[PDB]
């Protein structure tokens, strides 16, 4: 179940890239790995930056993308060559072209292997390409939201999670996290003004999944009740799981 201290692992900062696209994903004493990405419809483009923190250059810098078989059927990644020599204090760029074929839950693994000071260096970090990155936000009037909310048919399409807040509850931050996640934040739809409501469409090559979400805070309990209602059970499950970790 993914045990052990999450420090010096392949995912120490993964969660920091679910609601935003840029920042430092990884950093040891030799290498800094930064990111930027953009997505549109079921496609994306991610730039990975490799910074050499030393006064010595790296040789045979080889970054490779690894996807389990299951992930390869749902997510198509293509990349261009990367300068294999990185000067000390210098940075090199890698471009990853992304095509989402169908919804996916696993994450690609980025493996970095290079030479430094006459030694072999290897690093593996989970790449933050996640399902919500293919969101198309959909603004809509209150009445339209409720009509759609009430069109869910198979209970497997609704997924609910009542969890403990990992972060101080804060209205603006919460709004910011929902917007960053990808869906539209619909103001004043829930009659309870303390709740948040979102809506968007997840885009993939083979199917477009309509998505609705309700987030309910409980200050006393320091918990939230998050509900995902979408047109595909696996999408509800992955979005709920991803979103729950952000609060």
């Amino acid at each position: 179940g993914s045990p052990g201290i999450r420090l010096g692992s392949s995912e120490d900062n993964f969660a920091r890239f679910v609601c935003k696209n840029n920042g430092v994903l990884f950093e040891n004493q030799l290498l800094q790995i930064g990111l930027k990405s953009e997505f549109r419809q079921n496609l994306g483009r991610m730039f990975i930056f490799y910074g050499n923190k030393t006064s010595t250059q790296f040789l045979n810098f080889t970054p490779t993308l690894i996807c389990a078989d299951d992930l390869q059927t749902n997510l198509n990644l293509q990349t261009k060559p990367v300068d294999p020599t990185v000067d000390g204090g210098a940075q090199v760029q890698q471009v990853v072209n992304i095509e989402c074929i169908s919804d996916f839950t696993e994450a690609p693994v980025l493996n970095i292997q290079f030479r430094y000071g006459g030694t072999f260096q290897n690093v593996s970090v989970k790449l933050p390409i996640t399902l919500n990155k293919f969101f198309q936000p959909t603004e809509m009037a209150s009445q339209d939201f409720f009509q759609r909310w009430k069109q869910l048919s198979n209970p497997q399409q609704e997924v609910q999670n009542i969890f403990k807040a990992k972060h101080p509850m804060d209205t603006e931050i919460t709004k910011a996290k929902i917007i960053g996640f990808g869906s539209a934040l619909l103001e004043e739809v829930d009659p309870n003004p303390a709740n948040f409501v979102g809506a968007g469409i997840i885009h993939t090559k083979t199917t477009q999944i309509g998505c609705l979400l309700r987030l309910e805070p409980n200050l006393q309990a320091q918990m939230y009740r998050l509900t995902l209602r979408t047109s595909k059970d696996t999408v509800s499950q992955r979005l709920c799981e991803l979103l729950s970790e952000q609060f």
Binding site: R16, F17, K20, N21, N22, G23, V24, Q32, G34, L35, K36, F47, F49, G51
Partner: peptide, 7 residues
């Protein structure tokens, strides 16, 4: 544009 190193 946003800084790849700012996050």
């Amino acid at each position: 544009f946003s800084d790849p190193w700012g996050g």
